[PDB]
Amino acid sequence: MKIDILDKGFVELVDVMGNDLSAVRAARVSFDKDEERDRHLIEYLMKHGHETPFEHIVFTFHVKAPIFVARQWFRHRIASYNELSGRYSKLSYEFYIPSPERLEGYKTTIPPERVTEKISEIVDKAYRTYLELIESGVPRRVARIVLPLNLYTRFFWTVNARSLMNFLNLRADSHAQWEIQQYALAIARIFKEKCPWTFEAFLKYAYKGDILKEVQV
Amino acid sequence: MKIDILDKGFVELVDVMGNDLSAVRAARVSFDDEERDRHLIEYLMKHGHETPFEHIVFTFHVKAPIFVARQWFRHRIASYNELSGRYSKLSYEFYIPSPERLEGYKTTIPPERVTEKISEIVDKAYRTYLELIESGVPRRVARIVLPLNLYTRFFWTVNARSLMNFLNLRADSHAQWEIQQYALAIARIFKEKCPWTFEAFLKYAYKGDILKEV
Amino acid sequence: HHMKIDILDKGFVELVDVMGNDLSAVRAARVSFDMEERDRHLIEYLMKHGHETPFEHIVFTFHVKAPIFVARQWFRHRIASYNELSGRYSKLSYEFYIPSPERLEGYKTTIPPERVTEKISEIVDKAYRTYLELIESGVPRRVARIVLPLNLYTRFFWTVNARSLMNFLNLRADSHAQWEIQQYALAIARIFKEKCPWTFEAFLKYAYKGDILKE
Amino acid sequence: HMKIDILDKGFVELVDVMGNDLSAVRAARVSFDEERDRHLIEYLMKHGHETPFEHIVFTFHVKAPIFVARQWFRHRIASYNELSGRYLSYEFYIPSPERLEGYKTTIPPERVTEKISEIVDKAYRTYLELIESGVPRRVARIVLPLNLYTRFFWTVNARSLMNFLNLRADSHAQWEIQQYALAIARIFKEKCPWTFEAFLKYAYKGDILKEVQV
Ligand SMILES: Cc1cc2nc3c(=O)[nH]c(=O)nc-3n(C[C@H](O)[C@H](O)[C@H](O)COP(=O)(O)OP(=O)(O)OC[C@H]3O[C@@H](n4cnc5c(N)ncnc54)[C@H](O)[C@@H]3O)c2cc1C
Ligand SMILES: Cc1cc2nc3c(=O)[nH]c(=O)nc-3n(C[C@H](O)[C@H](O)[C@H](O)COP(=O)(O)OP(=O)(O)OC[C@H]3O[C@@H](n4cnc5c(N)ncnc54)[C@H](O)[C@@H]3O)c2cc1C
């Protein structure tokens, strides 16, 4: 399961431990099936705020996102992150350039395409300066500081279903920046595919945002 | 995988996400060479880059006396669900130490009389509990007379980094013997699922004594 | 900063220290050094819209004496710091929570509540005397102590931020919780209200999920 | 408030503190003579009993470049509130020539300082054009470079502060965050001298705080 996001971004599922029944077994503390009874229990748990059983469902995602999105993402502390660094992995340099349609709606004094062109221009210049600095023996740790906040980074994120639901409450919401809403929608889609019963109960009883009640998946 | 502990306890493995290669993939941040990969695991452990190990996760089902569970639940970086009578049925079993457990100390009464005195109190506390319940005292009030050797059960979901910290503290000869025995079983399952990480842990990061002796 | 509230027969919650007050959350939210109508309005705005991170910058330390059955539930709250009494550093005393007869009304028990209290006293006394005899005989405390009942009192220090404290109250200041833990939660609430009145009142108005704090 | 200037425009400032060395002593004894108390601190640190140090808490106000803030925010056992724009000002970290001498480079270090400064100016001017044109700040700002300064409040307990110093007060860390860690250390040492000295003797894994005073 890999979903493209923005112009060069993605969310890819690496691994998953458990499913809806993992929360049911944890609640009962039994490693021991009755679909209607198990679904009823998931709804009951969610309705009455017994959220600890959902901590026993765990996901690992591989996310490629711009730094300004990652910085918001990394504010979610009840999770594990490893970000790409030059020490273990080859680095590549790509940048998020908003399309004009991202920008029309805002009343601006120049055409939205001219905005896109200006952003692409300054990114091109900053990257050229960086490469020029690296070419000259400036270490990458120093030279990278000129690079803009729309630089893509990648990370692995391991997170349990409860903390994933908190992430959606905050980021799958029209108050959040549009870019991280788009990532949260992808995260929601993957969560729904793997834990459909927990996801549906979440939407019915626990979810505090707007977008996942109006946008399917 | 299930390991019996104490007289009626156990540690069983419920689920696991990942293996040694999950830490390797996380460090390199890539989803899509045996010896190079082992060398990376060792390199991460010896330099303290421990975050990649967070991407290996276990769920265990543990049955343990309350005094053991109390120490275990101090490990905050993990997830717990403890048996409740609201969702499942309760049983009443108690840990009675064996007479070998007290061989070591120069006790005034034989170790078998110690075992017997403990059994005796458990029987009396349990029968008082039952008498209160039969009288109409709610279970949540009645149960307060029950002893700390009463067995409880719990699910424990924990990542490999936190599990290592747990072994550092509990797989150690200064910890209480009973929790040592649980820590040894935890260690055994960890080793079976993540042999490379386990080995690098012992070599480079483990601070206790018992895992290098048994 | 010092307050102590007696709970149960021999228990208590004592305030050891506090960092900050309501304005600490206002300063955190703005990243500033403000030190009123605007400031209250902001606290209410944060609480209403669930922006709770500013409340993490208010921190309490409590000293709590509670029975083991209460402490076990309490220590389930992971986003906090605990240090529990140890014979390694401090002398140990042996006290137990005996419920009063009034605790056992509503309940239509087949023996009088006074006799329920007395039976609990008896079995506790026998357990403690067994513990003492085992200790007297050379049994280590770590082993002998396993016969002691769940109503044995322990003590601990609890350091916790206001956000986590509000989560605590949501769960424990609730009529579905055991009456004993409710009594401890009410004491925690009491101290929290006294030190952070604006946050506490906004919590009650907008975020508190329980029933007993508004009765 | 102790305010320590770091880099060209940065700082670390102490907003508040709860407790001092005696708060860890109280917590260890669970109970509300200097030499006995100092001895307990050393005993705790030596034998790994670190939970008592969780009862000393600091709140700091930090102004740092984004590339430093992003490393800092990886420390999860802490509370952060960062400037956003609807509860700003625009300064940038420009490395000094002396910062860059010591690497073999093909142009003088002062040229490098010059080229960073020029690209920053261009990115800033573009950002200002976009804002003037009606582009919201939250979109326009994505052209700004990683050396833009931000500000945040950090609340952190002494145990977690010590883990932060283990990782950031070390020569393998980026020099810029080392500078910030030295200032955090100075403030820690002033408020908690016995804990700090004990940390250096028994627990600190880094190098720089053993060579560099404060
Ligand atoms: C010799 C010795 C004697 C001890 N005696 C006692 C005693 O008398 N009383 C007592 O109560 N405890 C005592 N302990 C500690 C007790 O055993 C705890 O149960 C145990 O320390 C839990 O380990 P943890 O905090 O490392 O694990 P977790 O709670 O899982 O934490 C894992 C790691 O995360 C970090 N962490 C998590 N939460 C926080 C936080 N809130 N603040 C800062 N860092 C955090 C720490 O780095 C920690 O090591 C003693 C420990 C030792 C070694
Ligand atoms: C030599 C070296 C190279 C590194 N290179 C990289 C890199 O390329 N990319 C990268 O992303 N990071 C890298 N790091 C790690 C990164 O710097 C850490 O994210 C940061 O230092 C935070 O440290 P911490 O996890 O101890 O702090 P906190 O997040 O404050 O945690 C404090 C303590 O709590 C415990 N803890 C907290 N949360 C959890 C949890 N969810 N599960 C288990 N235990 C927990 C741990 O015991 C930890 O020590 C590297 C580290 C080292 C030592």
PDB file of N, CA and C in Angstrom, chain A residues 71-140:
ATOM      1  N   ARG A  71       7.990  18.744  10.372  1.00  0.00           N
ATOM      2  CA  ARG A  71       8.150  19.459  11.654  1.00  0.00           C
ATOM      3  C   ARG A  71       6.840  19.479  12.434  1.00  0.00           C
ATOM      4  N   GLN A  72       5.713  19.653  11.732  1.00  0.00           N
ATOM      5  CA  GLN A  72       4.416  19.547  12.383  1.00  0.00           C
ATOM      6  C   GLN A  72       4.208  18.083  12.813  1.00  0.00           C
ATOM      7  N   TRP A  73       4.562  17.141  11.949  1.00  0.00           N
ATOM      8  CA  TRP A  73       4.317  15.727  12.212  1.00  0.00           C
ATOM      9  C   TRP A  73       5.035  15.233  13.441  1.00  0.00           C
ATOM     10  N   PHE A  74       6.300  15.671  13.607  1.00  0.00           N
ATOM     11  CA  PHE A  74       7.217  15.237  14.644  1.00  0.00           C
ATOM     12  C   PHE A  74       6.841  15.822  15.989  1.00  0.00           C
ATOM     13  N   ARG A  75       5.875  16.727  16.011  1.00  0.00           N
ATOM     14  CA  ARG A  75       5.347  17.185  17.263  1.00  0.00           C
ATOM     15  C   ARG A  75       4.547  16.129  18.039  1.00  0.00           C
ATOM     16  N   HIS A  76       4.126  15.080  17.343  1.00  0.00           N
ATOM     17  CA  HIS A  76       3.398  13.949  17.912  1.00  0.00           C
ATOM     18  C   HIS A  76       4.423  13.020  18.571  1.00  0.00           C
ATOM     19  N   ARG A  77       4.551  13.184  19.850  1.00  0.00           N
ATOM     20  CA  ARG A  77       5.634  12.544  20.633  1.00  0.00           C
ATOM     21  C   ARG A  77       5.425  11.064  20.991  1.00  0.00           C
ATOM     22  N   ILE A  78       4.174  10.619  21.041  1.00  0.00           N
ATOM     23  CA  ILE A  78       3.857   9.207  21.417  1.00  0.00           C
ATOM     24  C   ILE A  78       3.887   8.356  20.153  1.00  0.00           C
ATOM     25  N   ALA A  79       5.114   8.111  19.715  1.00  0.00           N
ATOM     26  CA  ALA A  79       5.431   7.459  18.433  1.00  0.00           C
ATOM     27  C   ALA A  79       6.955   7.346  18.328  1.00  0.00           C
ATOM     28  N   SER A  80       7.412   6.595  17.329  1.00  0.00           N
ATOM     29  CA  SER A  80       8.875   6.397  17.082  1.00  0.00           C
ATOM     30  C   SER A  80       9.165   6.868  15.645  1.00  0.00           C
ATOM     31  N   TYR A  81      10.296   7.548  15.461  1.00  0.00           N
ATOM     32  CA  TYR A  81      10.673   8.162  14.197  1.00  0.00           C
ATOM     33  C   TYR A  81      12.086   7.845  13.935  1.00  0.00           C
ATOM     34  N   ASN A  82      12.411   7.551  12.681  1.00  0.00           N
ATOM     35  CA  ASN A  82      13.804   7.630  12.254  1.00  0.00           C
ATOM     36  C   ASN A  82      13.810   8.352  10.967  1.00  0.00           C
ATOM     37  N   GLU A  83      14.571   9.435  10.910  1.00  0.00           N
ATOM     38  CA  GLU A  83      14.641  10.260   9.730  1.00  0.00           C
ATOM     39  C   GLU A  83      15.909   9.937   8.935  1.00  0.00           C
ATOM     40  N   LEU A  84      15.803  10.060   7.622  1.00  0.00           N
ATOM     41  CA  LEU A  84      16.901   9.786   6.721  1.00  0.00           C
ATOM     42  C   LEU A  84      18.022  10.771   7.069  1.00  0.00           C
ATOM     43  N   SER A  85      19.234  10.283   7.193  1.00  0.00           N
ATOM     44  CA  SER A  85      20.405  11.115   7.335  1.00  0.00           C
ATOM     45  C   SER A  85      21.501  10.556   6.425  1.00  0.00           C
ATOM     46  N   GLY A  86      22.402  11.412   5.982  1.00  0.00           N
ATOM     47  CA  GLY A  86      23.514  10.957   5.125  1.00  0.00           C
ATOM     48  C   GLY A  86      24.431   9.846   5.648  1.00  0.00           C
ATOM     49  N   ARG A  87      24.444   9.637   6.959  1.00  0.00           N
ATOM     50  CA  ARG A  87      25.261   8.599   7.610  1.00  0.00           C
ATOM     51  C   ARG A  87      24.959   7.145   7.177  1.00  0.00           C
ATOM     52  N   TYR A  88      23.695   6.799   6.926  1.00  0.00           N
ATOM     53  CA  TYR A  88      23.354   5.406   6.554  1.00  0.00           C
ATOM     54  C   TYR A  88      22.833   5.189   5.152  1.00  0.00           C
ATOM     55  N   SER A  89      22.462   6.271   4.498  1.00  0.00           N
ATOM     56  CA  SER A  89      21.630   6.232   3.311  1.00  0.00           C
ATOM     57  C   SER A  89      22.062   7.298   2.333  1.00  0.00           C
ATOM     58  N   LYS A  90      21.806   7.044   1.057  1.00  0.00           N
ATOM     59  CA  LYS A  90      22.146   7.996   0.013  1.00  0.00           C
ATOM     60  C   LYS A  90      21.149   9.139   0.087  1.00  0.00           C
ATOM     61  N   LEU A  91      21.612  10.386  -0.039  1.00  0.00           N
ATOM     62  CA  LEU A  91      20.660  11.535   0.014  1.00  0.00           C
ATOM     63  C   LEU A  91      20.170  11.963  -1.381  1.00  0.00           C
ATOM     64  N   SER A  92      18.907  12.336  -1.532  1.00  0.00           N
ATOM     65  CA  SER A  92      18.475  12.954  -2.794  1.00  0.00           C
ATOM     66  C   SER A  92      17.735  14.228  -2.453  1.00  0.00           C
ATOM     67  N   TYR A  93      17.657  15.151  -3.409  1.00  0.00           N
ATOM     68  CA  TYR A  93      17.225  16.530  -3.145  1.00  0.00           C
ATOM     69  C   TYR A  93      16.082  16.906  -4.065  1.00  0.00           C
ATOM     70  N   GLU A  94      14.883  16.865  -3.532  1.00  0.00           N
ATOM     71  CA  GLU A  94      13.699  17.250  -4.254  1.00  0.00           C
ATOM     72  C   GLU A  94      12.880  18.219  -3.417  1.00  0.00           C
ATOM     73  N   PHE A  95      12.023  18.983  -4.066  1.00  0.00           N
ATOM     74  CA  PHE A  95      11.398  20.099  -3.406  1.00  0.00           C
ATOM     75  C   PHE A  95       9.903  20.149  -3.763  1.00  0.00           C
ATOM     76  N   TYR A  96       9.092  20.577  -2.817  1.00  0.00           N
ATOM     77  CA  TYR A  96       7.677  20.695  -3.015  1.00  0.00           C
ATOM     78  C   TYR A  96       7.374  22.075  -3.600  1.00  0.00           C
ATOM     79  N   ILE A  97       6.855  22.054  -4.822  1.00  0.00           N
ATOM     80  CA  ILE A  97       6.425  23.262  -5.505  1.00  0.00           C
ATOM     81  C   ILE A  97       4.903  23.254  -5.657  1.00  0.00           C
ATOM     82  N   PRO A  98       4.202  24.125  -4.920  1.00  0.00           N
ATOM     83  CA  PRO A  98       2.739  24.207  -4.994  1.00  0.00           C
ATOM     84  C   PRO A  98       2.274  24.475  -6.398  1.00  0.00           C
ATOM     85  N   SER A  99       1.256  23.764  -6.852  1.00  0.00           N
ATOM     86  CA  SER A  99       0.642  24.072  -8.111  1.00  0.00           C
ATOM     87  C   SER A  99      -0.154  25.407  -8.043  1.00  0.00           C
ATOM     88  N   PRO A 100      -0.419  26.014  -9.200  1.00  0.00           N
ATOM     89  CA  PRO A 100      -1.245  27.228  -9.236  1.00  0.00           C
ATOM     90  C   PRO A 100      -2.624  27.045  -8.586  1.00  0.00           C
ATOM     91  N   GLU A 101      -3.185  25.848  -8.690  1.00  0.00           N
ATOM     92  CA  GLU A 101      -4.551  25.603  -8.212  1.00  0.00           C
ATOM     93  C   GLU A 101      -4.590  25.526  -6.694  1.00  0.00           C
ATOM     94  N   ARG A 102      -3.431  25.294  -6.090  1.00  0.00           N
ATOM     95  CA  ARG A 102      -3.232  25.390  -4.642  1.00  0.00           C
ATOM     96  C   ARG A 102      -3.399  26.827  -4.143  1.00  0.00           C
ATOM     97  N   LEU A 103      -3.190  27.773  -5.058  1.00  0.00           N
ATOM     98  CA  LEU A 103      -2.980  29.186  -4.758  1.00  0.00           C
ATOM     99  C   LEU A 103      -4.111  30.086  -5.254  1.00  0.00           C
ATOM    100  N   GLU A 104      -4.840  29.662  -6.289  1.00  0.00           N
ATOM    101  CA  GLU A 104      -6.054  30.372  -6.707  1.00  0.00           C
ATOM    102  C   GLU A 104      -7.117  30.140  -5.622  1.00  0.00           C
ATOM    103  N   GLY A 105      -7.912  31.157  -5.326  1.00  0.00           N
ATOM    104  CA  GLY A 105      -8.708  31.156  -4.089  1.00  0.00           C
ATOM    105  C   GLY A 105      -8.180  32.260  -3.195  1.00  0.00           C
ATOM    106  N   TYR A 106      -6.858  32.319  -3.066  1.00  0.00           N
ATOM    107  CA  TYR A 106      -6.227  33.482  -2.461  1.00  0.00           C
ATOM    108  C   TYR A 106      -6.250  34.633  -3.464  1.00  0.00           C
ATOM    109  N   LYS A 107      -6.752  35.774  -3.028  1.00  0.00           N
ATOM    110  CA  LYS A 107      -6.754  36.946  -3.878  1.00  0.00           C
ATOM    111  C   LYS A 107      -5.335  37.499  -3.847  1.00  0.00           C
ATOM    112  N   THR A 108      -4.604  37.316  -4.944  1.00  0.00           N
ATOM    113  CA  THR A 108      -3.226  37.789  -5.042  1.00  0.00           C
ATOM    114  C   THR A 108      -3.088  38.813  -6.151  1.00  0.00           C
ATOM    115  N   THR A 109      -1.981  39.542  -6.161  1.00  0.00           N
ATOM    116  CA  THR A 109      -1.800  40.634  -7.123  1.00  0.00           C
ATOM    117  C   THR A 109      -1.094  40.197  -8.412  1.00  0.00           C
ATOM    118  N   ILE A 110      -0.561  38.983  -8.407  1.00  0.00           N
ATOM    119  CA  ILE A 110      -0.046  38.339  -9.616  1.00  0.00           C
ATOM    120  C   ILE A 110      -0.726  36.985  -9.806  1.00  0.00           C
ATOM    121  N   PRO A 111      -0.760  36.505 -11.059  1.00  0.00           N
ATOM    122  CA  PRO A 111      -1.392  35.226 -11.350  1.00  0.00           C
ATOM    123  C   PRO A 111      -0.824  34.117 -10.515  1.00  0.00           C
ATOM    124  N   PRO A 112      -1.673  33.153 -10.136  1.00  0.00           N
ATOM    125  CA  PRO A 112      -1.119  32.046  -9.364  1.00  0.00           C
ATOM    126  C   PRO A 112       0.090  31.336 -10.036  1.00  0.00           C
ATOM    127  N   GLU A 113       0.160  31.273 -11.364  1.00  0.00           N
ATOM    128  CA  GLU A 113       1.297  30.579 -12.025  1.00  0.00           C
ATOM    129  C   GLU A 113       2.611  31.290 -11.808  1.00  0.00           C
ATOM    130  N   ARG A 114       2.545  32.613 -11.694  1.00  0.00           N
ATOM    131  CA  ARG A 114       3.714  33.445 -11.406  1.00  0.00           C
ATOM    132  C   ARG A 114       4.232  33.199 -10.009  1.00  0.00           C
ATOM    133  N   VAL A 115       3.338  32.910  -9.080  1.00  0.00           N
ATOM    134  CA  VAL A 115       3.763  32.474  -7.760  1.00  0.00           C
ATOM    135  C   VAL A 115       4.542  31.166  -7.817  1.00  0.00           C
ATOM    136  N   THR A 116       3.942  30.161  -8.456  1.00  0.00           N
ATOM    137  CA  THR A 116       4.629  28.896  -8.681  1.00  0.00           C
ATOM    138  C   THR A 116       6.030  29.103  -9.319  1.00  0.00           C
ATOM    139  N   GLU A 117       6.116  29.977 -10.321  1.00  0.00           N
ATOM    140  CA  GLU A 117       7.379  30.234 -11.034  1.00  0.00           C
ATOM    141  C   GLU A 117       8.411  30.881 -10.108  1.00  0.00           C
ATOM    142  N   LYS A 118       7.955  31.821  -9.276  1.00  0.00           N
ATOM    143  CA  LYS A 118       8.849  32.461  -8.325  1.00  0.00           C
ATOM    144  C   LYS A 118       9.369  31.510  -7.264  1.00  0.00           C
ATOM    145  N   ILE A 119       8.530  30.573  -6.805  1.00  0.00           N
ATOM    146  CA  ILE A 119       8.955  29.588  -5.830  1.00  0.00           C
ATOM    147  C   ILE A 119       9.938  28.628  -6.484  1.00  0.00           C
ATOM    148  N   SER A 120       9.632  28.210  -7.708  1.00  0.00           N
ATOM    149  CA  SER A 120      10.532  27.300  -8.387  1.00  0.00           C
ATOM    150  C   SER A 120      11.910  27.972  -8.621  1.00  0.00           C
ATOM    151  N   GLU A 121      11.891  29.251  -8.983  1.00  0.00           N
ATOM    152  CA  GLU A 121      13.113  30.015  -9.198  1.00  0.00           C
ATOM    153  C   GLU A 121      14.022  30.049  -7.981  1.00  0.00           C
ATOM    154  N   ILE A 122      13.477  30.463  -6.848  1.00  0.00           N
ATOM    155  CA  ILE A 122      14.284  30.621  -5.635  1.00  0.00           C
ATOM    156  C   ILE A 122      14.788  29.277  -5.078  1.00  0.00           C
ATOM    157  N   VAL A 123      13.978  28.238  -5.198  1.00  0.00           N
ATOM    158  CA  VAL A 123      14.406  26.872  -4.863  1.00  0.00           C
ATOM    159  C   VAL A 123      15.591  26.446  -5.730  1.00  0.00           C
ATOM    160  N   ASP A 124      15.492  26.683  -7.040  1.00  0.00           N
ATOM    161  CA  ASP A 124      16.571  26.378  -7.988  1.00  0.00           C
ATOM    162  C   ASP A 124      17.879  27.094  -7.606  1.00  0.00           C
ATOM    163  N   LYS A 125      17.779  28.366  -7.205  1.00  0.00           N
ATOM    164  CA  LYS A 125      18.952  29.130  -6.825  1.00  0.00           C
ATOM    165  C   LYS A 125      19.562  28.630  -5.514  1.00  0.00           C
ATOM    166  N   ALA A 126      18.701  28.340  -4.533  1.00  0.00           N
ATOM    167  CA  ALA A 126      19.185  27.870  -3.235  1.00  0.00           C
ATOM    168  C   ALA A 126      19.889  26.510  -3.392  1.00  0.00           C
ATOM    169  N   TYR A 127      19.308  25.625  -4.194  1.00  0.00           N
ATOM    170  CA  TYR A 127      19.905  24.294  -4.433  1.00  0.00           C
ATOM    171  C   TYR A 127      21.260  24.411  -5.138  1.00  0.00           C
ATOM    172  N   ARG A 128      21.328  25.253  -6.163  1.00  0.00           N
ATOM    173  CA  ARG A 128      22.593  25.537  -6.855  1.00  0.00           C
ATOM    174  C   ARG A 128      23.675  26.044  -5.907  1.00  0.00           C
ATOM    175  N   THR A 129      23.311  26.961  -5.002  1.00  0.00           N
ATOM    176  CA  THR A 129      24.246  27.445  -3.994  1.00  0.00           C
ATOM    177  C   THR A 129      24.752  26.334  -3.083  1.00  0.00           C
ATOM    178  N   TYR A 130      23.838  25.503  -2.606  1.00  0.00           N
ATOM    179  CA  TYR A 130      24.168  24.361  -1.792  1.00  0.00           C
ATOM    180  C   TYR A 130      25.188  23.462  -2.513  1.00  0.00           C
ATOM    181  N   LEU A 131      24.896  23.084  -3.758  1.00  0.00           N
ATOM    182  CA  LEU A 131      25.774  22.152  -4.501  1.00  0.00           C
ATOM    183  C   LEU A 131      27.140  22.780  -4.669  1.00  0.00           C
ATOM    184  N   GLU A 132      27.137  24.065  -4.995  1.00  0.00           N
ATOM    185  CA  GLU A 132      28.337  24.872  -5.099  1.00  0.00           C
ATOM    186  C   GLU A 132      29.185  24.894  -3.813  1.00  0.00           C
ATOM    187  N   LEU A 133      28.520  25.042  -2.678  1.00  0.00           N
ATOM    188  CA  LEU A 133      29.186  24.935  -1.387  1.00  0.00           C
ATOM    189  C   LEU A 133      29.780  23.532  -1.127  1.00  0.00           C
ATOM    190  N   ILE A 134      29.032  22.472  -1.448  1.00  0.00           N
ATOM    191  CA  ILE A 134      29.507  21.078  -1.285  1.00  0.00           C
ATOM    192  C   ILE A 134      30.697  20.767  -2.201  1.00  0.00           C
ATOM    193  N   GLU A 135      30.613  21.244  -3.444  1.00  0.00           N
ATOM    194  CA  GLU A 135      31.675  21.135  -4.438  1.00  0.00           C
ATOM    195  C   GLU A 135      32.993  21.698  -3.887  1.00  0.00           C
ATOM    196  N   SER A 136      32.893  22.724  -3.033  1.00  0.00           N
ATOM    197  CA  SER A 136      34.045  23.439  -2.496  1.00  0.00           C
ATOM    198  C   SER A 136      34.572  22.911  -1.162  1.00  0.00           C
ATOM    199  N   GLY A 137      33.990  21.849  -0.629  1.00  0.00           N
ATOM    200  CA  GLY A 137      34.499  21.239   0.603  1.00  0.00           C
ATOM    201  C   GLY A 137      33.774  21.658   1.863  1.00  0.00           C
ATOM    202  N   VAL A 138      32.766  22.518   1.734  1.00  0.00           N
ATOM    203  CA  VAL A 138      31.885  22.800   2.868  1.00  0.00           C
ATOM    204  C   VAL A 138      31.126  21.530   3.236  1.00  0.00           C
ATOM    205  N   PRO A 139      31.218  21.098   4.510  1.00  0.00           N
ATOM    206  CA  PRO A 139      30.524  19.876   4.856  1.00  0.00           C
ATOM    207  C   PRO A 139      29.015  20.027   4.728  1.00  0.00           C
ATOM    208  N   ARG A 140      28.340  18.915   4.458  1.00  0.00           N
ATOM    209  CA  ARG A 140      26.934  18.911   4.129  1.00  0.00           C
ATOM    210  C   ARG A 140      26.100  19.480   5.282  1.00  0.00           C
TER     211      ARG A 140
END
